[PDB]
Design a protein around this motif. Structure first.
Motif, PDB file in Angstrom:
ATOM      1  N   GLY A  79      25.214  57.914 -10.582  1.00  0.00           N
ATOM      2  CA  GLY A  79      25.791  57.373 -11.705  1.00  0.00           C
ATOM      3  C   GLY A  79      24.733  57.617 -12.871  1.00  0.00           C
ATOM      4  N   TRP A  80      23.422  57.156 -12.360  1.00  0.00           N
ATOM      5  CA  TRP A  80      22.397  57.349 -13.073  1.00  0.00           C
ATOM      6  C   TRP A  80      22.095  58.882 -13.816  1.00  0.00           C
ATOM      7  N   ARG A  81      22.197  59.800 -12.600  1.00  0.00           N
ATOM      8  CA  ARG A  81      22.036  61.146 -12.925  1.00  0.00           C
ATOM      9  C   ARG A  81      23.144  61.570 -13.860  1.00  0.00           C
ATOM     10  N   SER A  82      24.192  60.850 -13.492  1.00  0.00           N
ATOM     11  CA  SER A  82      25.488  61.625 -14.291  1.00  0.00           C
ATOM     12  C   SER A  82      25.407  61.230 -15.929  1.00  0.00           C
ATOM     13  N   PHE A  83      24.540  60.006 -16.009  1.00  0.00           N
ATOM     14  CA  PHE A  83      24.370  59.155 -17.419  1.00  0.00           C
ATOM     15  C   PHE A  83      23.227  60.053 -18.306  1.00  0.00           C
ATOM     16  N   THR A  84      22.090  60.301 -17.264  1.00  0.00           N
ATOM     17  CA  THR A  84      21.034  61.105 -18.059  1.00  0.00           C
ATOM     18  C   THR A  84      20.944  62.540 -18.190  1.00  0.00           C
ATOM     19  N   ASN A  85      21.846  63.204 -17.213  1.00  0.00           N
ATOM     20  CA  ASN A  85      21.972  64.546 -17.353  1.00  0.00           C
ATOM     21  C   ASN A  85      23.046  65.186 -18.256  1.00  0.00           C
ATOM     22  N   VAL A  86      24.263  64.479 -17.963  1.00  0.00           N
ATOM     23  CA  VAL A  86      25.487  64.956 -18.673  1.00  0.00           C
ATOM     24  C   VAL A  86      26.112  63.804 -19.836  1.00  0.00           C
ATOM     25  N   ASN A  87      25.539  62.823 -20.118  1.00  0.00           N
ATOM     26  CA  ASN A  87      25.962  61.617 -20.693  1.00  0.00           C
ATOM     27  C   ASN A  87      27.372  61.140 -20.242  1.00  0.00           C
ATOM     28  N   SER A  88      27.660  61.122 -19.012  1.00  0.00           N
ATOM     29  CA  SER A  88      28.606  60.724 -18.268  1.00  0.00           C
ATOM     30  C   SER A  88      29.898  61.582 -18.549  1.00  0.00           C
ATOM     31  N   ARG A  89      29.601  62.737 -19.185  1.00  0.00           N
ATOM     32  CA  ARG A  89      30.787  63.773 -19.224  1.00  0.00           C
ATOM     33  C   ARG A  89      31.380  64.127 -17.905  1.00  0.00           C
ATOM     34  N   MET A  90      30.631  64.261 -16.870  1.00  0.00           N
ATOM     35  CA  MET A  90      30.934  64.441 -15.663  1.00  0.00           C
ATOM     36  C   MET A  90      30.066  63.870 -14.758  1.00  0.00           C
ATOM     37  N   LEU A  91      30.328  64.092 -13.135  1.00  0.00           N
ATOM     38  CA  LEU A  91      29.715  63.328 -12.346  1.00  0.00           C
ATOM     39  C   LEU A  91      28.735  64.454 -11.627  1.00  0.00           C
ATOM     40  N   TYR A  92      27.535  64.305 -11.906  1.00  0.00           N
ATOM     41  CA  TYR A  92      26.532  64.786 -11.318  1.00  0.00           C
ATOM     42  C   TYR A  92      26.146  64.660  -9.957  1.00  0.00           C
ATOM     43  N   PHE A  93      26.909  65.067  -8.869  1.00  0.00           N
ATOM     44  CA  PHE A  93      26.588  64.835  -7.453  1.00  0.00           C
ATOM     45  C   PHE A  93      25.160  65.592  -7.172  1.00  0.00           C
ATOM     46  N   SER A 107      39.394  66.773  -5.112  1.00  0.00           N
ATOM     47  CA  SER A 107      38.819  65.965  -3.787  1.00  0.00           C
ATOM     48  C   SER A 107      39.387  64.809  -3.234  1.00  0.00           C
ATOM     49  N   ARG A 108      40.704  64.517  -4.045  1.00  0.00           N
ATOM     50  CA  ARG A 108      41.351  63.377  -3.269  1.00  0.00           C
ATOM     51  C   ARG A 108      40.518  61.923  -3.671  1.00  0.00           C
ATOM     52  N   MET A 109      39.494  61.715  -4.292  1.00  0.00           N
ATOM     53  CA  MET A 109      38.731  60.790  -4.443  1.00  0.00           C
ATOM     54  C   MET A 109      38.658  60.339  -6.034  1.00  0.00           C
ATOM     55  N   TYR A 110      39.848  60.766  -6.481  1.00  0.00           N
ATOM     56  CA  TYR A 110      39.964  60.267  -8.057  1.00  0.00           C
ATOM     57  C   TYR A 110      39.440  59.043  -8.444  1.00  0.00           C
ATOM     58  N   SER A 111      40.328  57.977  -7.875  1.00  0.00           N
ATOM     59  CA  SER A 111      40.022  56.582  -8.135  1.00  0.00           C
ATOM     60  C   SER A 111      38.642  56.204  -8.083  1.00  0.00           C
ATOM     61  N   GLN A 112      37.718  56.580  -6.968  1.00  0.00           N
ATOM     62  CA  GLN A 112      36.444  56.169  -6.844  1.00  0.00           C
ATOM     63  C   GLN A 112      35.461  56.718  -7.982  1.00  0.00           C
ATOM     64  N   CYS A 113      35.840  58.478  -8.188  1.00  0.00           N
ATOM     65  CA  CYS A 113      35.202  58.939  -9.202  1.00  0.00           C
ATOM     66  C   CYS A 113      35.213  58.561 -10.547  1.00  0.00           C
ATOM     67  N   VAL A 114      36.366  58.050 -10.799  1.00  0.00           N
ATOM     68  CA  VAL A 114      36.710  57.609 -12.181  1.00  0.00           C
ATOM     69  C   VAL A 114      35.634  56.181 -12.405  1.00  0.00           C
ATOM     70  N   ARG A 115      35.617  55.595 -11.211  1.00  0.00           N
ATOM     71  CA  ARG A 115      34.682  54.037 -11.357  1.00  0.00           C
ATOM     72  C   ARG A 115      33.545  54.361 -11.519  1.00  0.00           C
ATOM     73  N   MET A 116      32.938  55.403 -10.731  1.00  0.00           N
ATOM     74  CA  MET A 116      31.502  56.008 -10.858  1.00  0.00           C
ATOM     75  C   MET A 116      31.337  56.541 -12.096  1.00  0.00           C
ATOM     76  N   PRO A 189      32.311  47.442  -4.671  1.00  0.00           N
ATOM     77  CA  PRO A 189      33.618  47.811  -4.456  1.00  0.00           C
ATOM     78  C   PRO A 189      33.745  49.378  -4.449  1.00  0.00           C
ATOM     79  N   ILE A 190      33.121  50.177  -5.254  1.00  0.00           N
ATOM     80  CA  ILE A 190      32.929  51.419  -5.348  1.00  0.00           C
ATOM     81  C   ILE A 190      32.552  52.065  -3.915  1.00  0.00           C
ATOM     82  N   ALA A 191      31.388  51.457  -3.543  1.00  0.00           N
ATOM     83  CA  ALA A 191      31.076  51.912  -2.078  1.00  0.00           C
ATOM     84  C   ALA A 191      32.080  51.686  -0.918  1.00  0.00           C
ATOM     85  N   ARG A 192      32.917  50.510  -1.265  1.00  0.00           N
ATOM     86  CA  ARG A 192      33.820  50.273  -0.268  1.00  0.00           C
ATOM     87  C   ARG A 192      34.974  51.188  -0.296  1.00  0.00           C
TER      88      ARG A 192
END
Ligand SMILES: C[C@](O)(COc1ccc(F)cc1)C(=O)Nc1ccc([N+](=O)[O-])c(C(F)(F)F)c1
Length: 238
Positions: A79-93, A107-116, A189-192
């Protein structure tokens, strides 16, 4: 001294080795998420063992805590990388594994991704500093334990208390502590949801052509179920 250490041991860039020249597919994206997860685990272990006072924990408690906190630790850092690298525009795994909404869906992990992605935006909205981030991330390692307790529960409790005290110091305040602890709680909750997803995926991996690295497979089948069945639980502030 404390922050000097946290900054010093913070893992560098970790790539997934994903083929971005190939059209996106469920099997490829997940195999890359699994490989990336395993690669990051190597670093999480080296990181944890270099943390102040961690060596005091019983050898077996050290590994268990790392394996249970693994997902959460990764979520918070992603979440931090996403924020600093692309201003939360995308998820920087990872540099070579960035998720846009299309990949979040595939990826079928849409719910979790949006929470992240929301967590990622939180770093900006709450104006989380790099030092608060580092201390909060270390605290996450000491935020999930077994109901039957650890081998040396007391040493663990002492260590967790000391890390909380370090956060207090970084903050120095009441409102800030409330904000940060609430943010930390949101990680669980996200990790869960991701744990549940990884578990179901492993059980049917042979049906969807998804590759699971050895360490991850063992952890998902031995440790994750303890969390999903309630034997191992996160420590919430609220
Ligand atoms: C699907 C999966 O490969 C599962 O990985 C697991 C990781 C830990 C665990 F206990 C069980 C499974 C995964 O979620 N990988 C993943 C890889 C990297 C990152 N990352 O760098 O933050 C994440 C993330 F934490 F975002 F969700 C997730």
């Amino acid at each position: 001294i404390f922050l000097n250490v946290l900054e010093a041991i913070e893992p560098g860039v970790v790539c997934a080795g994903h083929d971005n020249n190939q059209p996106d597919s469920f099997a490829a994206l997940l195999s890359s998420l699994n490989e990336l997860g395993e690669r990051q685990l190597v670093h999480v272990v080296k990181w944890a063992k270099a943390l102040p006072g961690f060596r005091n924990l019983h050898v077996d408690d050290q590994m268990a805590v790392i394996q249970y906190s693994w997902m959460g630790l990764m979520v918070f850092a992603m979440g931090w990388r996403s924020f600093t690298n692309v201003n939360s525009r995308m998820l920087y795994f990872a540099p070579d594994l960035v998720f846009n909404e299309y990949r979040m869906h595939k990826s079928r992990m849409y719910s979790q991704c949006v929470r992240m992605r929301h967590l990622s935006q939180e770093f900006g909205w709450l104006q989380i500093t790099p030092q608060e981030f580092l201390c909060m991330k270390a605290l996450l390692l000491f935020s999930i334990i077994p109901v039957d307790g650890l081998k040396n529960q007391k040493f663990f409790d002492e260590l967790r208390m000391n890390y909380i005290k370090e956060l207090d110091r970084i903050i120095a305040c009441s409102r800030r502590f409330y904000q940060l602890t609430k943010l930390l709680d949101s990680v669980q909750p996200i990790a869960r949801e991701l744990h549940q997803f990884a578990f179901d995926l492993l059980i049917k991996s042979h049906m969807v052509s998804v590759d699971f690295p050895e360490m991850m497979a063992e952890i998902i089948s031995v440790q994750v179920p303890k969390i999903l069945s309630g034997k191992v639980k996160p420590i919430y502030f609220h």
